[PDB]
Design a protein around this ligand. Sequence first.
Ligand SMILES: O=c1c2sc(Cl)cc2n2c(=S)[nH]nc2n1CC1CC1
Length: 217
Amino acid sequence: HMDCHLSDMLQQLHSVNASKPSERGLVRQEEAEDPACIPIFWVSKWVDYSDKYGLGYQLCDNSVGVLFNDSTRLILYNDGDSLQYIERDGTESYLTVSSHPNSLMKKITLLKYFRNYMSETPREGDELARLPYLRTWFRTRSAIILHLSNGSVQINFFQDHTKLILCPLMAAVTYIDEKRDFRTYRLSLLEEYGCCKELASRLRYARTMVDKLLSSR
Ligand SMILES: O=c1c2sc(Cl)cc2n2c(=S)[nH]nc2n1CC1CC1
């Protein structure tokens, strides 16, 4: 095996859910907000063509990746040129679009079409590489579940277009609501101060989704 970050996340979710944080005489959800736990990376767009090629995604920094159906991964860094390719074993190989690798043209070509299908820059100084990639994903009737290589799990809920970003290193959750406002909470402080029924319900769903990620392994 079980991934250690997913195991930690499962325990954190078990603890907050066991406190029944919405079933309280006094709910003070704002006191659990902690902007120091803000996620640096989240998935801003995705496109599911896994029936034929794979799942495309774009991160907040405008890098794009495709997780292909062979469990290999090709990422185009936000500079438009630098490529990271991850094998099924996890071995990482760094290339450029300028240099031409024949064994990867088809995947490189697909990545460009996926990028443009999702499309309608350095978002900060330096910060090259150490970019997370999509480890695995699955979808249900109500959500898509995205597990990133930095241990974060993002759950996008189709119906109301809300999102949860769970970070096990900081034991935090960021909730993006239908208005698209984002707020970051420490899970332990949600236990202490309570939260609304909606967030409590999504955290129960999240734990069920993390169980799935761990059972699939
Ligand atoms: O603009 C965003 C948005 S918009 C939605 Cl939705 C989620 C996020 N987000 C997370 S999550 N972490 N950081 C961000 N930022 C960056 C701004 C603080 C500088």
